[PDB]
Design a protein around this ligand. Structure first.
Ligand SMILES: Cc1cn([C@H]2C[C@H](OP(=O)(O)O)[C@@H](COP(=O)(O)O)O2)c(=O)[nH]c1=O
Ligand SMILES: [Ca+2]
Length: 129
């Protein structure tokens, strides 16, 4: 896989962000994770986490997997990096996202994320508390 440039347009919630990608605004949904909705438990904390990560970043990058690049709602499906750190992984490592939506052939980073979830679970963090 390869990293491509993007710039933040706006934080949305724990697992969606609006970015400019190839000069066009698009909403990106984070591959392989699920954060609580804002109205749910840890929803606000997940939103805040992702928002701080993407807003504080000097460099945002998107990385498409091998398969489908847009979902049925038109959202970009990608791994999102903030100054080199994967947002998807980081949210799972903090116990603010579960590994989820693991579809065949867009699952390159599944094992990396499951390892983070295991460590989050062990620490009894947030969702796992
Ligand atoms: C993360 C991801 C979500 N989706 C679709 C599945 C779910 O469909 P449904 O809307 O029918 O439940 C939805 C969940 O996204 P959200 O967790 O953002 O609601 O997005 C994909 O199709 N591919 C993906 O990789
Ligand atoms: Ca969600």
């Amino acid at each position: 896989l390869h990293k491509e440039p993007a710039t933040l347009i706006k934080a949305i919630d724990g697992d969606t962000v609006k970015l400019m990608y190839k000069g066009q605004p698009m909403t990106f949904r984070l591959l392989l994770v699920d954060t609580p909705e804002f109205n749910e438990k840890y929803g606000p904390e997940a939103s805040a986490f992702t928002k701080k990560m993407v807003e504080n970043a000097k460099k945002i990058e998107v990385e498409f997997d091998k398969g489908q690049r847009t979902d049925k709602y038109g959202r970009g499906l990608a791994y999102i990096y903030a100054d080199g750190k994967m947002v998807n992984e980081a949210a799972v490592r903090q116990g603010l996202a579960k590994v989820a939506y693991v579809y065949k052939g867009n699952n390159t980073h599944e094992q990396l994320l499951r390892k983070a979830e295991a460590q989050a679970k062990k620490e009894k963090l947030n969702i796992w508390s």
